[PDB]
From a paper:
The FimH type-1 fimbrial adhesin allows pathogenic Escherichia coli to adhere to glycoproteins in the epithelial linings of human bladder and intestinal tract, by using multiple fimbriae simultaneously. Pauci- and high-mannose type N-glycans are natural FimH receptors on those glycoproteins. The lectin domain of the fimbrial adhesin FimH from E. coli recognizes with the highest affinity and in monovalent fashion oligomannose-3 and -5 N-glycans. Hereby, we describe the conversion from monovalent- to bivalent N-glycan binding to the FimH lectin domain, with two full N-glycan structures, namely α1,6-fucosylated oligomannose-3 (Man3Gn2F1) and oligomannose-6 (Man6Gn2).
To visualize the interaction between FimH and core-fucosylated oligomannose-3, we have performed cocrystallization and obtained a crystal structure at 1.4 Å resolution. The ligand Man3Gn2F1 interacts with FimH via its α1,3-arm, and the mannose binds in the monosaccharide-binding pocket (M) of FimH via the conserved ligand residues Phe1, Ile13, Asn46, Asp47, Tyr48, Ile52, Gln133, Asn135, Tyr137, and Asn140. The two glycans, Man3Gn2F1 and Man3Gn2 respectively, interact with FimH via the Manα1,3Manβ1 disaccharide, oriented in the mannose-binding pocket of FimH in a similar way. The interaction created with Manα1,3Manβ1,4GlcNAc is therefore the same for the two ligands and allowed to maintain the potential hydrogen bond between O6 of GlcNAc 2 and the hydroxyl group of Thr51. The α1,6-fucosylated N-acetylglucosamine 1 in one of the FimH monomers of the asymmetric unit has a very high motility and was modeled in two alternate conformations, altA and altB. In one FimH monomer, the larger Man3Gn2F1 ligand samples more space, by rotating around the GlcNAc 1–GlcNAc 2 glycosidic bond (torsion angle ψ), resulting in at least two alternate conformations. On the other FimH monomer, two fucoses are close in the crystal packing and take on the altB conformation near the side chain of Tyr137. Core α1,6-fucosylation of oligomannose-3 does not change its binding through the α1,3-linked mannose arm. The preference of FimH is markedly selective for the α1,3-linked mannose branch of α1,6 core-fucosylated oligomannose-3, identical to what was found for oligomannose-3 without fucose. That is interesting, because the crystal structure of FimH in complex with Man3Gn2F1 confirmed previous data on Man3Gn2 binding, in that the chitobiose moiety (GlcNAc 2–GlcNAc 1) gets priority over Manα1,6Manβ1 (4′-3) for interactions with FimH in the monovalent binding mode in their competition for the same space.
Residue numbers in the entry:
A (entry chain A), B (entry chain B): 1 to 158
Amino acid sequence: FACKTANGTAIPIGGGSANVYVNLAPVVNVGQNLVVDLSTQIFCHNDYPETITDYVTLQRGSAYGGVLSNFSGTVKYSGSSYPFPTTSETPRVVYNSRTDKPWPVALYLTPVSSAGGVAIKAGSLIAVLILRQTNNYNSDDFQFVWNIYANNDVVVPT
Amino acid sequence: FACKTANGTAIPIGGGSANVYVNLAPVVNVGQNLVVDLSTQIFCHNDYPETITDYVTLQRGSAYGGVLSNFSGTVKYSGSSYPFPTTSETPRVVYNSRTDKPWPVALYLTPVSSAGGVAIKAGSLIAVLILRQTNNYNSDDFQFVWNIYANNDVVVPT
Ligand SMILES: CC(=O)N[C@@H]1[C@@H](O)[C@H](O[C@@H]2O[C@H](CO)[C@@H](O[C@@H]3O[C@H](CO[C@H]4O[C@H](CO)[C@@H](O)[C@H](O)[C@@H]4O)[C@@H](O)[C@H](O[C@H]4O[C@H](CO)[C@@H](O)[C@H](O)[C@@H]4O)[C@@H]3O)[C@H](O)[C@H]2NC(C)=O)[C@@H](CO[C@@H]2O[C@@H](C)[C@@H](O)[C@@H](O)[C@@H]2O)O[C@H]1O
Ligand SMILES: CC(=O)N[C@@H]1[C@@H](O)[C@H](O[C@@H]2O[C@H](CO)[C@@H](O[C@@H]3O[C@H](CO[C@H]4O[C@H](CO)[C@@H](O)[C@H](O)[C@@H]4O)[C@@H](O)[C@H](O[C@H]4O[C@H](CO)[C@@H](O)[C@H](O)[C@@H]4O)[C@@H]3O)[C@H](O)[C@H]2NC(C)=O)[C@@H](CO)O[C@H]1O
Ligand code: NI
Ligand code: NI
């Protein structure tokens, strides 16, 4: 089991960490959501699907920086919605093919009423999402840690 | 502050996520209404009412599946109606007793004029409703995320 990003970086068998940059709507008002869909950027696969079934959760999602200070959020994982920052590890998604399959995570972020001006700075860390991978074969229990960075400033009109 | 569902589950203090399985009118003709009344399904309480006032909004409601594609409608929250899918967070409802009190959310849906046949597939996701809870006591700001599923097919006769 391993994963890769659309930009080209990889996290190998056994887990690790990577940095992912995301494009953000540059202007967001109270009542609107910024949608950060990581399923177009993070892809994983099972390396021995004939003999092993891989199980993949969103172990935790955390907010940083301007997302932590200026937004409230939800996360959608494989069709179900949860608070973001997260309160518990999600149910599992099965990975059962050598063909890359997206990691089905998307953030929905909405400004709090005190947000205004530059609420998320370009290049800043906005979130950490921890993918936990186990299987039905041995004791492997690995973390793939995705550090999510903004490409651009996000402004909340005042 | 925490919440529970009928014959069901709980989302504890600090928020979280749950699935709610709802029975739906099985036959809804064009021009008839499908009401999804969550006030019989979702109940909340204040855990320290002698000292704290809890405030609860419908921060967002979103449609999925056959409700998104085959119905149009509104959401009523505590006596007032609003567009559904929602465009703004609602006014607050006060919770001030340890006795379970309903969350006063209902969807009022009507088939689109081209709908016919199976318009809501049994077991499918129909809505996500985000309950936001704050108080007059500390900085708590917690999301209770309700993933709403149809227990049965809804047919629009032709
Ligand atoms: C006359 C007067 O008011 N005197 C003050 C005391 O009331 C006060 O004691 C507070 O009282 C509040 C109730 O109003 C209690 O708050 C609840 O705490 C629950 C958790 O308590 C446990 O965990 C704490 C750490 O998590 C720990 O410190 C405690 O000892 C307990 O083990 C919490 O679940 C609850 O919140 C839920 O419920 C409400 C109501 O529905 C929701 O609004 C919330 O969102 C959440 O769902 C609520 O917070 C305090 O436990 C109690 N503290 C103590 C030590 O007894 C004291 C202390 O004030 C606290 O300390 C000050 C410094 C400040 O930080 C306050 O915010 C704290 O409550 O002060 C007296 O003067
Ligand atoms: C009929 C039959 O197959 N009988 C079995 C043999 O299959 C079995 O041989 C093993 O088959 C398993 C697959 O089920 C292999 O498991 C993977 O091993 C690789 C690493 O393998 C390389 O490294 C091994 C030593 O480290 C070498 O022996 C081997 O030759 C290779 O060079 C792991 O990377 C895999 O795990 C990764 O992928 C899975 C799936 O995505 C994830 O779940 C993991 O978390 C991890 O990301 C598997 O562990 C194993 O290599 C095969 N062994 C050999 C020698 O070929 C044989 C051995 O016990 O037993 C017979 O009964
Ligand atoms: Ni591989
Ligand atoms: Ni209670």
